[PDB]
From TrEMBL:
Keywords: Signal. Residues 37-89 form the YdgH/BhsA/McbA-like domain. Residues 1-21 form the signal peptide. InterPro entries: Dodecin-like, YdgH-like_sf, YdgH/BhsA/McbA-like_dom. Pfam families: YdgH_BhsA-like. The gene is yahO. This is Putative periplasmic protein.
Length: 99
């Protein structure tokens, strides 16, 4: 076959060992920071669970999947909970450089 392939690779900067923790954000601030946050997916509870037990399971699970912000969108009923929690991951950019 007519020869003509090129391989242009170049790696010199790569260090991925930074892990952040997921926490519940105020809905107001959450919506405002969501502009600088990414969606890794929404989580849920199925079957039948205890309210706080499902919370803690959801919270750790979301954090386990590498989230920065977590929100209990639903699932705060009681036992018959088929709820959903919506989680966000921090982007690499944000408003200015200050905290």
């Amino acid at each position: 076959m007519k020869t003509g392939y090129k391989v242009m690779l170049g790696a010199l900067a790569f260090v991925v060992t930074n892990v952040y923790a997921a926490e519940i954000m105020k809905k107001t601030d959450f919506d405002k920071v969501a502009s600088e946050y990414t969606k890794i997916g929404t989580i849920s509870t199925t079957g039948e669970m205890s309210p706080l037990d499902a919370r803690e399971d959801l919270i750790k699970k979301a954090d386990e999947k590498g989230a920065d912000v977590v929100v209990l969108t639903s699932g705060q009923t009681e036992n018959k909970i088929h709820g959903t929690a919506d989680i966000y991951k921090k982007k690499l950019e944000h408003h200015h450089h200050h905290h």
